[PDB]
């Protein structure tokens, strides 16, 4: 284990947040200085990873494409399953819009460059539409939430927990979720030299986050109370939020996931969202457990006296 592990996490990095709350890493690795740094979103976290002020971070599938397209050598060390039920396009319940095709000509709010921008490009494409076929309305979630409530847009593409919060307030309906959109999953990233130097350690760390995520099922009451506090949201919103997640696993990134991530990188480059095509497979860490090298010798001679 290394001298220190500085972890970048977000409020929705469930494995990380539960591991932190339960002090699992501090207890498992008493010889490492474990530290936790909360970021407001993936891009800011990856900036920190890239200047070297943190060693391991959790983000969705989109932020890493931006960083890597800019030349960051950050590697994918682990992937979690996608959450198709947690990523949605919402309309008002009694909206005459019944399918994604019905969005043609309408105003749709979402954050530019976000997981919702990706969902929306893909959903529209299924229905034989492009962004030139609607009025894309680029807004961050607080600004979008207001516009949607005021009937200034007809649909809002957004992620959880905003989704669950809007849902419980009533009046809204999921027009489309990520289910048939073959989503990729969320990722854990590190700098390549740290991953290569600390292979066994990282694997154990990730395995710890996966154990911690499982507490949301085995200790649901306690975990809901924790996340209501840390996220600052009502317990029923957290309950809905957990109900939209599949069982979490953290695994090495396989060929299939790599190909899905490559598809998204291509989509983003094709739409000039990033300036470069990226070779996603070059950024996949093949797990290793490299033993550190030590230079050690012995001078035998007279009887060994243990200590004089």
């Amino acid at each position: 284990s290394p001298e220190a592990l500085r972890i970048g996490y977000q409020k929705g990095s469930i494995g990380m947040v539960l591991a932190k709350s339960h002090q699992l890493l501090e207890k498992r690795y008493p010889e490492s200085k474990i530290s936790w740094v909360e970021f407001p979103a993936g891009p800011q976290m990856l900036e920190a990873l890239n200047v070297g002020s943190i060693d391991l971070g959790s983000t969705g599938d989109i932020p890493p494409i931006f960083a890597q397209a800019a030349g960051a050598d950050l590697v994918y060390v682990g992937v979690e399953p996608p959450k198709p039920k947690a990523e949605v396009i919402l309309v008002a319940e009694n909206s005459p819009i019944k399918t994604v095709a019905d969005l043609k000509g309408h105003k749709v709010a979402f954050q530019k460059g976000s997981s919702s921008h990706n969902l929306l490009l893909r959903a529209l494409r299924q229905a034989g539409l492009k962004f030139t076929d609607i009025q894309p309305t680029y807004l961050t979630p607080a600004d979008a939430r207001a516009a949607f409530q005021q009937g200034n847009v007809d649909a809002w593409a957004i992620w959880d927990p905003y989704y669950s919060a809007a849902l419980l307030q009533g009046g809204v309906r999921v027009l489309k979720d990520g289910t048939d959109l073959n989503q990729t999953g969320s990722f854990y990233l590190a700098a390549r030299p740290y991953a290569e130097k600390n292979g066994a350690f990282i694997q154990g760390v990730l395995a710890t986050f996966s154990e911690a995520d499982a507490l949301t099922r085995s200790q649901r009451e306690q975990s809901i109370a924790l996340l209501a506090k840390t996220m600052g949201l009502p317990a029923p919103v957290i309950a809905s939020y957990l109900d939209h997640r599949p069982p979490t696993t953290i695994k090495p990134v396989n060929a299939e996931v790599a190909a899905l991530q490559q598809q998204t990188a291509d989509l983003f480059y094709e739409n000039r969202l990033v300036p470069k095509k990226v070779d996603i497979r070059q950024r996949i860490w093949q797990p290793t457990q490299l033993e550190g090298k030590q230079l050690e010798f012995r001078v035998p001679g007279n009887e060994n006296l243990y200590f004089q």
Side-chain angles (χ1 to χ4, degrees):
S1 92
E3 197 162 332
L5 168 59
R6 304 162 292 173
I7 306 166
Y9 72 101
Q10 301 178 60
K11 286 180 187 299
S13 301
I14 300 311
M16 286 184 169
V17 167
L18 268 80
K20 176 190 182 288
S21 289
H22 291 263
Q23 295 188 357
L24 299 178
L25 290 186
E26 291 85 355
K27 292 185 284 153
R28 292 185 187 186
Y29 303 102
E31 191 145 9
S32 301
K33 189 178 136 174
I34 306 302
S35 61
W36 293 94
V37 185
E38 189 190 84
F39 287 89
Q44 293 92 317
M45 180 275 149
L46 290 181
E47 294 184 337
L49 202 59
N50 207 225
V51 295
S53 63
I54 54 166
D55 305 304
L56 177 66
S58 153
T59 83
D61 54 320
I62 303 315
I65 296 169
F66 286 81
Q68 298 163 341
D73 190 24
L74 308 177
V75 293
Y76 300 94
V77 288
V79 60
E80 296 168 303
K83 299 194 320 157
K85 294 170 150 161
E87 186 91 45
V88 302
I89 301 175
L90 295 171
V91 296
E93 288 178 318
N94 324 106
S95 177
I97 307 160
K98 199 140 173 211
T99 61
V100 171
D102 293 336
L103 295 167
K104 191 160 181 184
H106 289 113
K107 304 167 213 272
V108 181
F110 58 99
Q111 187 176 269
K112 186 177 157 173
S114 73
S115 56
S116 297
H117 189 151
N118 179 59
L119 174 95
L120 185 62
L121 282 172
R122 291 166 194 265
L124 292 178
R125 184 163 57 186
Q126 285 193 321
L129 302 173
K130 288 186 169 76
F131 271 22
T132 48
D133 292 306
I134 65 166
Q135 286 213 284
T137 302
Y138 300 110
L139 297 174
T140 62
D143 292 333
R145 178 177 58 217
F148 185 52
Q149 283 166 350
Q150 297 166 10
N152 284 342
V153 288
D154 301 312
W156 181 26
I158 193 61
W159 54 93
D160 245 342
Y162 296 108
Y163 156 36
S164 290
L167 186 63
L168 296 182
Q169 186 171 72
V172 304
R173 143 167 85 78
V174 171
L175 182 73
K176 179 64 172 180
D177 69 17
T179 286
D180 297 319
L181 300 175
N182 293 22
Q183 297 191 309
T184 298
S186 51
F187 292 105
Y188 291 85
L189 293 99
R192 186 192 314 266
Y194 189 88
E196 290 281 333
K197 181 157 216 187
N198 302 291
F201 176 71
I202 288 299
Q203 294 189 53
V205 166
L206 298 176
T208 300
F209 299 151
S210 181
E211 292 176 51
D213 195 305
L215 300 174
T216 66
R217 182 184 187 156
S218 61
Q219 280 162 46
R220 187 179 160 93
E221 182 187 19
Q222 166 186 77
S223 297
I224 283 169
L226 170 73
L227 292 171
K229 183 170 316 195
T230 60
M231 294 191 175
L233 289 174
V237 175
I238 300 307
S240 184
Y241 177 87
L242 291 183
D243 286 343
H244 303 143
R245 296 172 86 238
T248 289
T249 56
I250 302 160
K251 302 180 181 199
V253 190
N254 72 21
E256 183 179 328
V257 171
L260 298 160
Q261 182 70 348
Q262 187 61 66
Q263 275 160 40
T264 303
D266 301 342
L267 185 59
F268 275 54
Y269 169 69
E270 285 159 5
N271 289 267
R272 318 167 33 176
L273 293 168
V274 293
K276 283 198 200 288
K277 216 184 172 295
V278 183
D279 184 356
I280 295 298
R281 289 161 184 95
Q282 191 279 328
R283 300 297 208 283
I284 287 169
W285 179 64
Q286 298 289 293
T288 55
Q289 298 169 244
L290 292 185
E291 281 129 11
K293 300 271 192 148
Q294 191 161 78
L295 301 169
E296 67 191 328
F297 303 103
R298 179 162 56 89
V299 176
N302 195 203
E303 295 133 5
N304 181 294
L305 294 185
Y306 302 96
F307 189 84
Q308 280 293 288

